[PDB]
Write a structure and sequence with these properties.
Radius of gyration: 19 Å
Strand content: under 5%
PDB class: splicing
Keywords: Chlamydomonas spliceosome, Cdc5L, RNA splicing
Oligomer: part of a larger assembly
Order of helices and strands: HH
Structural class: mainly alpha
Bound molecules: magnesium ion
Shape: rod-shaped
Name: Cdc5L
Number of strands: 0
Entry title: Cryo-EM structure of the Chlamydomonas C* complex
Family: Belongs to the CEF1 family.
Length: about 40
RNA sequence: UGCUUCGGCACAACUGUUAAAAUUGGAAAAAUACAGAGAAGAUUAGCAUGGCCCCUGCGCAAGGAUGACACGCAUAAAUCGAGAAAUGGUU
């Protein structure tokens, strides 16, 4: 079963990791922008 | 200073980016914290390509993580007509 699950994952995956950083990083930046706008308010 | 009919002539001819400043602004770096690496399973050699990306180098070398980046994540609708049927107006 661990072999079959390793197989299933490795047969599905074509991505890389930093795309995950991507959206999260943009959200972080957006949050920072919102905080700055609030400070300006 | 010559020459002087001693009256005067002659010669010589325009420095300074002008600051001992004043601002004035833009800069690399440092720490901090962030976060922290190609290829397809993993681990790994690279050589490229493109340019409003550079750095080191005397460089038409070589290197910088294959220097980096890009590299697609294609929520890139790459999109629509054929026909029967059937229903709607009008006679
Ligand atoms: Mg190369
Ligand atoms: Mg090189
Ligand atoms: Mg190496
Ligand atoms: Mg390169």
């Amino acid at each position: 079963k661990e072999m079959l699950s390793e197989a299933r994952a490795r047969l599905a995956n074509t991505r890389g990791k930093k795309a995950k950083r991507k959206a999260r990083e943009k959200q972080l930046e957006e949050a920072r922008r919102l905080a700055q706008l609030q400070k300006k308010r």
